[PDB]
Design a protein that fits this description.
This protein is mostly beta strands and 29 residues long. 0% of the residues lie in helices and 28% in strands. It is built from no helices and 2 strands. It has a two-stranded antiparallel ribbon with strand order 1-2. It is globular, with a radius of gyration of 7 Å. The chain starts with 14 loop residues before the first strand and ends in a 5-residue tail after the last strand.
Length: 29
C-alpha cells in the first residue's frame, strides 16, 4: 500500500494499518 496510518487509519482500500505502513493482508504494498 505504501501509505501510512495517521492513527490506525489507512486510505488504501483493504489496507490494514501496520508499522508506519498500510498492508494488504500483511503485504506492505
Amino acid at each position: 500500500c505504501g501509505e501510512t496510518c495517521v492513527g490506525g487509519t489507512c486510505n488504501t482500500p483493504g489496507c490494514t494499518c501496520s508499522k508506519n505502513k498500510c498492508t494488504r493482508n500483511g503485504l506492505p504494498v
